Amino acid sequence: NDLMKKKRIVENDKSKILTTIEDLDQKKNQALNIAWQKVNKDFGSIFSTL
């Protein structure tokens, strides 16, 4: 019973923690994309003005 309680704990925490890992991985990806595109358009405007 302790083994199955542990295994339930392992599958539950593994599921929520790994899904948090990929979810914040894509969150990091879209934050990088919006920051990169903002810096790209700003640097392009800066260089075209200079």
Swiss-Prot record:
Top-rank taxon, per record: Eukaryota
Subcellular location: Nucleus; Cytoplasm; Chromosome
Disulfide bonds: none
Function, as annotated: Central component of the condensin complex, a complex required for conversion of interphase chromatin into mitotic-like condense chromosomes. The condensin complex probably introduces positive supercoils into relaxed DNA in the presence of type I topoisomerases and converts nicked DNA into positive knotted forms in the presence of type II topoisomerases.
Summary of subunit composition and partner proteins: Forms a heterodimer with SMC4. Component of the condensin complex, which contains the SMC2 and SMC4 heterodimer, and three non SMC subunits that probably regulate the complex: BRRN1/CAPH, CNAP1/CAPD2 and CAPG. Interacts with BRD4 (isoform B), leading to insulate chromatin from DNA damage response pathway.
Annotated domain remarks: The SMC hinge domain, which separates the large intramolecular coiled coil regions, allows the heterodimerization with SMC4, forming a V-shaped heterodimer.
Family statement: Belongs to the SMC family. SMC2 subfamily.
Protein name in the entry: Structural maintenance of chromosomes protein 2
Organism: Homo sapiens (Human)
Lineage of origin: Eukaryota, Metazoa, Chordata, Craniata, Vertebrata
